[PDB]
């Protein structure tokens, strides 16, 4: 397996991705340990162009661990003020 760094050069504002899951969920639809997952990537959006993929489990956001994060904790981390948005992910 591999850990992968996917970096989104933000115009910031829209990322073009959706997430499901988090530590506050006792299950997810992707792989059986709780976590936050990419559940959607808009085909012509930033995340898609940058190589993000449905099924990616988000491990960290700009260095911040989100393996155990609640859903809202992961949302807050992803919405940090504009920079390159560096996602450490794993595909189970």
């Amino acid at each position: 397996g591999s850990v992968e760094e996917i970096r989104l050069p933000r115009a910031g504002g829209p990322l073009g991705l959706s997430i499901v899951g988090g530590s506050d969920h006792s299950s997810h639809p992707f792989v059986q340990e709780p976590g936050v997952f990419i559940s959607k990537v808009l085909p012509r959006g930033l995340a898609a162009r940058s190589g993000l993929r449905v099924g990616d489990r988000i491990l960290a956001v700009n260095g911040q661990d989100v393996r155990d994060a609640t859903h809202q904790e992961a949302v807050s981390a992803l919405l940090r003020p504009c920079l390159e948005l560096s996602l450490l992910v794993r595909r189970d």
Partner: peptide, 8 residues
């Protein structure tokens, strides 16, 4: 079963 999906 259903999971909230947050669009960003």
């Amino acid at each position: 079963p259903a999971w909230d999906e947050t669009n960003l």
